[PDB]
């Protein structure tokens, strides 16, 4: 979970979401792309 | 249902043929020497494509087709290897009669409507490896 | 994609070979390889047959160009049409043996004389 | 062909101009020829999307002012420094 203040789409399968007032980046493909803002 | 490109009267080295279609259940020496018995007529040094058709009983039927556009363009321009830098560096030459001979061989081997369509697909493989058409 | 101008020109080409053609056959094109389809395109240019897969609501506009208008309900489902510009038949005799050879798709409804022929009676052509 | 609608300016100076620019309108001028100058105001948007073509600068356009057209060319134009905006346009009578 890369936790950082700039979060992005690292491929075409990464999908941005706002859960509980946090912006995360979720991937089906690549567990390494899982991000949270912070 | 496999395909390979095998030199004219040749077969049964280990890295090119035996393992590739040998993991598929095919008897190796019947393919090898019925293919050297069929392709004994292909000139020495030309790879000729062979389409191997395998069935659930391992008895196979292969259609040996005519030598590649690239191999008949290696031989009709006289050359050995084509260009490593195609249409930048140009390695040989063929008049339209050789485009049309290679495209009668491949008139047996193409999808083309006319010998102009097969001459144009051999034109395409003539621009691919660098060769000049003259 | 296709601009309105694109679609207009293409409707003009289908309407133009439709006027010039003696007989037509509409069929399902689904579930068949491009290998067997280029095989029926060779068996097509050999029989004089003009082969096409064209949009449906495009073919209502081209077939409004007469007298194939009995075919406008044959355009529901994927449409592959065989126009024989040379000879009538040779589309309808080629398609039944191609669909029995493949055992895929359908070959639904034909048109000749200005009338539509149901699927089991295309043996007339 | 480009047709720009405009009104005659009843005011002048820095104040007038900046109230103009706040209202999403902007000042320009029409001079050249035998006549006197004519100061006018325009809609920022219309013109901003109009000069978004090249010909605007090479061509004879028309300006509708109080029922009356004038035919003019684009002479020079000063733009706001960093903003996608127009401060002003010099129109020369065509």
């Amino acid at each position: 979970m890369k936790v950082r203040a700039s979060v992005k789409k690292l491929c075409r399968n990464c999908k941005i979401v706002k859960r509980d007032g946090v912006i995360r980046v979720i991937c089906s493909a690549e567990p390494k792309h899982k991000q949270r803002q912070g | 249902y496999v395909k390979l490109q095998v030199a004219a009267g040749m077969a049964n080295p280990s890295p090119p043929v035996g393992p590739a279609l040998g993991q598929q259940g095919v008897n190796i020496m019947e393919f090898c020497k019925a293919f050297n018995a069929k392709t004994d007529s292909i000139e020495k040094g030309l790879p000729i494509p062979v389409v191997i058709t395998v069935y659930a009983d391992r008895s196979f039927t292969f259609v040996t087709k005519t030598p590649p556009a690239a191999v008949l363009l290696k031989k009709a321009a006289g050359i050995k290897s084509g260009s490593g830098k195609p249409n930048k560096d140009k390695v040989g030459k063929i008049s339209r009669a050789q485009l049309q001979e290679i495209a009668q061989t491949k008139a047996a081997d193409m999808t083309g409507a006319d010998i102009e369509a097969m001459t144009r697909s051999i034109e395409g493989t003539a621009r691919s490896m660098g060769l000049v058409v003259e | 994609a296709l601009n309105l101008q694109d679609k207009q020109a293409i409707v003009a080409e289908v309407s133009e070979v439709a006027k010039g053609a003696l007989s037509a056959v509409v069929a399902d094109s689904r579930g068949v390889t491009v290998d067997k389809m280029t095989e029926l395109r060779k068996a097509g240019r050999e029989a004089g047959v003009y082969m096409r897969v064209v949009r449906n609501t495009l073919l209502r506009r081209a077939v409004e160009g007469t007298p194939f208008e009995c075919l406008k309900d044959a355009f529901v489902g994927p449409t592959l049409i065989a126009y024989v510009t040379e000879h009538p038949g040779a589309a309808a005799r080629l398609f039944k043996e191609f669909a029995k050879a493949n055992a895929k798709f359908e070959v639904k409804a034909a048109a000749f004389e200005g009338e539509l022929i149901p699927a089991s009676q295309i043996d007339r052509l | 062909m480009f047709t720009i609608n405009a009104e005659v300016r009843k005011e002048q100076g820095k104040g007038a101009s900046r109230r103009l620019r706040a209202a999403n309108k902007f000042p320009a001028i029409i001079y050249g020829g035998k006549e006197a100058p004519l100061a006018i105001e325009l809609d920022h948007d219309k013109v901003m999307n109009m000069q978004a073509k090249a010909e605007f600068y090479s061509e004879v356009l028309t300006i509708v002012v109080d029922g009356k057209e004038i035919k003019v060319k684009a002479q020079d134009v000063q733009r706001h420094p960093y903003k996608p905006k127009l401060q002003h346009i010099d129109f020369v009578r065509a």
């Binding site: - | - | - | 020079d76 420094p81 960093y82």
Partner: protein, 136 residues
């Protein structure tokens, strides 16, 4: 790393940075990187940036640098009281006002240029935008 070959005087008044920029327009290239915000550019910044957009174009097209760091900044070192003169010359800077054009570019595809300029601006202290040269 840019710096005046020779100067009239060695040191300078801190001065102010006020008002707007001159050279608001792209006079050479097809595209340019314009500054929206107001700030001082050290030579280091400009150099690093020029590098960034030089990697980005794979050394094709052409790049101008419209700004020059001509004014010297001083610093007294640590642990030194006030007075005893003016500090020693540390580095050079260019005063930047809103609407200057930092770099110009051309001979390249637009998309690529917007990109290269994003990468260039990552290295800059101030707010910047992309711009195209116009007719008139």
């Amino acid at each position: 790393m840019l710096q005046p070959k020779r100067t009239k005087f060695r040191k300078m008044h801190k001065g102010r940075n006020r008002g707007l920029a001159q050279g608001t327009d792209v006079s050479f290239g097809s595209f340019g990187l314009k500054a929206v915000g107001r700030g001082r550019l050290t030579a280091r910044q400009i150099e690093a940036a020029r590098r960034a957009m030089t990697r980005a174009v794979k050394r094709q097209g052409k790049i101008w640098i419209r700004v020059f760091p001509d004014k010297p900044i001083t610093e007294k070192p640590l642990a030194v009281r006030m007075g005893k003169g003016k500090g020693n010359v540390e580095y050079w800077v260019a005063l930047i006002q809103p609407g200057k054009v930092l770099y110009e570019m051309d001979g390249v595809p637009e998309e690529l240029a917007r990109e290269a300029f994003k990468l260039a601006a990552a290295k800059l202290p101030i707010k910047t935008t992309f711009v195209t040269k116009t007719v008139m």
